[PDB]
From Swiss-Prot, chain A:
Residues annotated with Phosphotyrosine modification: Y4
Signal peptide: none
Gene (name only): DCTN2
Role description: Part of the dynactin complex that activates the molecular motor dynein for ultra-processive transport along microtubules. In the dynactin soulder domain, binds the ACTR1A filament and acts as a molecular ruler to determine the length. Modulates cytoplasmic dynein binding to an organelle, and plays a role in prometaphase chromosome alignment and spindle organization during mitosis. Involved in anchoring microtubules to centrosomes. May play a role in synapse formation during brain development.
Name of protein: Dynactin subunit 2
Location in or out of the cell: Cytoplasm, Cytoskeleton; Cytoplasm, Cytoskeleton, Microtubule organizing center, Centrosome; Membrane
Family classification: Belongs to the dynactin subunit 2 family.
Disulfide pattern: none
Chain intervals for the UniProt region annotation (Disordered): 1-23
Subunit organization: Subunit of dynactin, a multiprotein complex part of a tripartite complex with dynein and a adapter, such as BICDL1, BICD2 or HOOK3. The dynactin complex is built around ACTR1A/ACTB filament and consists of an actin-related filament composed of a shoulder domain, a pointed end and a barbed end. Its length is defined by its flexible shoulder domain. The soulder is composed of 2 DCTN1 subunits, 4 DCTN2 and 2 DCTN3. The 4 DCNT2 (via N-terminus) bind the ACTR1A filament and act as molecular rulers to determine the length.
Swiss-Prot record, chains B, C, D:
Subunit composition and interactions: Part of the ACTR1A/ACTB filament around which the dynactin complex is built. The filament contains 8 copies of ACTR1A and 1 ACTB. Interacts with dynein and adapters such as BICD2. Interacts with BCCIP (isoform 2/alpha).
Pfam families: Actin
Cysteine disulfide partners in this protein: none
SUPFAM superfamilies: Actin-like ATPase domain (SSF53067)
SMART domains: ACTIN
Main location: cytoplasm
GO MF annotations in UniProt: ATP binding
Location in the cell: Cytoplasm, Cytoskeleton; Cytoplasm, Cytoskeleton, Microtubule organizing center, Centrosome; Cytoplasm, Cell cortex
Species assigned in the record: Sus scrofa (Pig)
The protein, known as: Alpha-centractin
A GO CC annotation given for this chain: cell cortex
């Protein structure tokens, strides 16, 4: 604390931080109807030579 | 020569993009522009100030928000220009447009100047060799692995139903009305000032949309849940205040069935779909009642599909099956279908060369789009 | 070319100064202006009467004092010029006007005509190459290193709270109440008459201020500590005397939260703070409930921050981690951060083009006043 | 009763009242709260501790001023009780809360909770034979004798424009800004300290009101008058002093057209009204170009009309004739229209028995107002 000695204004005991006390979907399973699955690779395999 | 395909989606609400051979688009972010909303003064922080992405997805009451593609219609071309340039980022693309095939997603029933202007962008500013834009309906059918089906969507502010038989259809039998979630949040905001809730900033409205997507359900019973007395359950703020809700949480999404209340002579997805079916063959309608497809991210709710089927069964014909439940991710499914289309091998037919496009103009665009 | 500027920290009463890139303001003293209260005839004294400096403390009981920088605003232009000329003394400066630039402090929300006349002084009478004056909150930013946050500073008679995120201003969000320690000493004087005293002389009042900055603290509890009775500790008197105090010493700074004691429809430090909080996004508030440090010796009190935290708990909403931030540099922190600033690219983009400046009139940077 | 039901010009800034058939709202007074600022000790002083009338706005330095209405909506119901007691004063009525039907005014887009709260007071405190509240816009056209037209009120609570086609309201097309002249006064206070004028008191605020309504005016040219070399005319203060004016005399009302300068996101009264026009039919707007009605006390300005006309000129459509009315009484006319309404025997639906309110509540009135 070099500069601090020259400071006539010094008083301790309180920190310099602001921190007090600390204290730390049906569109998926719709039973209404039926849906599809992802299956990317096998879908392309399913649609392998289904070109023009 | 051919290169690696880039799977991109014109996300009405949130843009989606990735490459070929993937399974999930790694770049999904909103459709606006975030430019300086306040007085940027002392240097020492991130500047340029027209920030879009994680900063905008982080800092909210700091940048003004401007959406150029409304109803899937880009109005501020310049905004999509630098939006696309943001997609060309080292965070996002790290490559060059002039070297890879790029697939994008066409929006039904829009003017020619739109895609023509965009083609000019990616063929003059950008010089994309292989470029194509198309319908997500067939892509959704690839996601189902099926051929016949009626695809219905719910974009940001877009809805449309398409009857399909193996990728053969009647253009006259398709229905479309630009309406979805954004206006639902707008009507929510109406309810807010109806009971005095001061919400009008850009990011403030974004927060309201988050509330909408979270603190809202679908009450299948219309009058039974509207004529009663509520409790007005409360939901927190990012700031922390837990504010009351009431019947509004289901009133606003149920407005889709009554555009008259919003001052609009629309017909509603149910009637829209029914009339689309009415514009077809006779016995083939049954086959199509079985094969129906849902899409669009605005569809995400609770008490959603049951309400839909309730409406359908109120206006149903002589007992025909209906089959559309919850797949993995409807939005992603479109992008995934884009990856499917990107995985094609005879895919060369999806575009014309740049040089020839220069010798083509709007001509080849519409002569080959259909 | 090589001209190290001089960081000059002004203030309500106190002024600090030192060259660029230093670590301690080489010369510091207040706005004390004195001239002999008596009549001399016999040779042995000094002549001129404008005897301000260490001689004033050396000759307290002889001269009359005054402070023309009312609420940080200059009144006796001539006297301020003389003060600055005293600053220009050799052992005080040894430099010339043209020889070096100067950095200075701007107390906001004041008539710019003050700055006009002063700029004319330093660029016409004195001919400093460039002089920049600025917001004291920025100084606190450099001292802290942080760029986000609010800073409420208090000199001897002015308090201003500046909420700025990432060094980017929100002028409407800024709040203030300009009253501090000066009237607290006057309030102490009132208490002295309640105790049967009067220290009406200028130097006598200075002694009273020494008591103020010497025999005081902040009791966290107002009435819980007010209903009791202390032992009335005694203060040594430069008269070789010692006199009791009473619970007044901590009861007197309660005016900081109660303008009722002075009888004025004002609000309060914490209230100003809270209102500035209200004046922002609902988001950043929680985040800025950690980035606030206060400056000035007006903050040097036992129980200062603790009572303030009690006020916070009474006013802030639920569950936000907020204790209190305070270094032992709060006084000098301003000059220090100004040195940090001035020891950089200030002149590279912000300064006075003196020649061209007065050629374009003072309104030029008075347009660039922010 | 066979006599005059209570007609109340429920005024935002200044509330007035009288009766049916009459053309004079016999009592007019602002929406403030007058309690004292000091404590009488001397036996034989004036007492009451709650003051209205001229004595209240006489000893401003002795009477604490507390405006209880917020955005045209009071939240200090206790003060409203006392206000209505003053309405029932011997200087005013000497009547009962049962002898006549009560007609009050409102603004739309408010929480129904206000209407609830209101009627709760009106029937728990009073035993009113019939209560009714509505929009002054109807009453405004009644004063003009018209059927259609768009009316924008400028009160000190809320400034709102209503498009009207023969009473068949368009709730999806009404606009409502919550700005007031009160903020312009506050803004003037900002100009005061900018020009160096120490004003913060509630008593000073009314003096600023006098300044607003007298020393301020409207400069037609937007930016051409912004660059005018001011002369800073001086207003002789009523107490006996004098203070300059500056260009601020017309700058402050422009915030009503540029709310973003203060940070409020809107588009300017003019554009907002045009947007209301845009929220309507096509050729019916053509009628509205001729159908332009002015209202509100915050419209009385030297330069107001023609400047606003120029605003409209910039907002004008392609070569369409536009007529703009300007009634004398832009406030009083509403009260008179209410007197007309109260002079109707067809007030059947409007008169509601107190017993009916006991049976249902404000919902019963909501059915009538909706
Ligand atoms: N929890 C949710 N509830 C309802 N809608 C949602 C939810 N989460 C996201 N969304 C919707 O995502 C939609 C974005 O449009 P989207 O369907 O993604 O079309 P695109 O893929 O073209 O952007 C919005 O309409 C919004 O309603
Ligand atoms: N030890 C102390 N105790 C109480 N107050 C003090 C002390 N030292 C300084 N102060 C007050 O704090 C203020 C310092 O804040 P600053 O803005 O630097 O002051 P100034 O505006 O006068 O330069 C001083 O003006 C003084 O009134
Ligand atoms: N002569 C005037 N010039 C300008 N503004 C005025 C004048 N008289 C009243 N006002 C404005 O009218 C507002 C008061 O609200 P007011 O129009 O009285 O609504 P209400 O009658 O519903 O109370 C104030 O903001 C005030 O500035």
């Amino acid at each position: 604390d070099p500069k601090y000695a020259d400071l006539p204004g010094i008083a301790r005991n309180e920190p310099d931080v602001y921190e007090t006390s600390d204290l730390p979907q049906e569109e998926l399973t719709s039973t209404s109807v039926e849906h599809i699955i992802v299956n990317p690779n096998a879908a392309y395999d399913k649609f392998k030579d289904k070109r023009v | 020569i051919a290169n690696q395909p880039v799977v991109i989606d014109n996300g009405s609400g949130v843009i989606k993009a990735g490459f070929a051979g993937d399974q999930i688009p790694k770049y999904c972010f909103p459709n606006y522009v975030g430019r300086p909303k306040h007085v940027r003064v002392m240097a020492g922080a991130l500047e340029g100030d027209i920030f879009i992405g994680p900063k905008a997805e982080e800092h909210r009451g700091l940048l003004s928000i401007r959406y150029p593609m409304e109803h899937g219609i880009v109005k501020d071309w310049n905004d999509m220009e630098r939006i696309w340039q943001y997609v060309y980022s080292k965070d996002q693309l790290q490559t060059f447009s002039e070297e890879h095939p790029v697939l994008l997603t066409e929006a039904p029933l829009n003017p020619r100047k739109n895609r023509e202007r965009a083609a000019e962008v990616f063929f003059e500013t950008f010089n994309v060799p292989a470029l194509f834009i198309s319908m997500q309906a067939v892509l959704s059918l690839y996601a189902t692995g099926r051929t016949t089906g009626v695809v219905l969507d719910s974009g940001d502010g877009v809805t449309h139903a398409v009857p399909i038989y193996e990728g053969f259809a009647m253009p006259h039998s398709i229905m479309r009305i630009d309406i979805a979630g954004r206006d639902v949040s707008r009507f929510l905001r109406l309810y807010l000032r109806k009971e005095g809730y001061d919400f009008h900033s850009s990011s403030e409205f974004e927060i309201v949309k988050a509330i909408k997507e979270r603190a809202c359900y679908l009450s299948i019973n219309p009058q039974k849940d509207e004529t009663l007395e509520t409790e007005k359950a409360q939901y927190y703020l990012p700031d922390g205040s837990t504010i009351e809700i009431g019947p509004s949480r289901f009133r606003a999404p149920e407005l889709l069935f009554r555009p008259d209340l919003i001052g609009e002579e629309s017909e509603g997805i149910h009637e829209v779909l029914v009339f689309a079916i009415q514009k077809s063959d006779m016995d083939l309608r049954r086959t199509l009642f079985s094969n129906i497809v849902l899409s669009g991210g605005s569809t995400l709710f609770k008490g959603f599909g049951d309400r839909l089927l309730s409406e359908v069964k109120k206006l149903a014909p002589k007992d025909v099956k209906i089959r559309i439940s919850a797949p993995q991710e409807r939005l992603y499914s479109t992008w995934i279908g884009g990856s499917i289309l990107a995985s094609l091998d005879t895919f060369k037919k999806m575009w014309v060369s740049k040089k020839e496009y220069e010798e083509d103009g709007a001509r080849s665009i519409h002569r080959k789009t259909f």
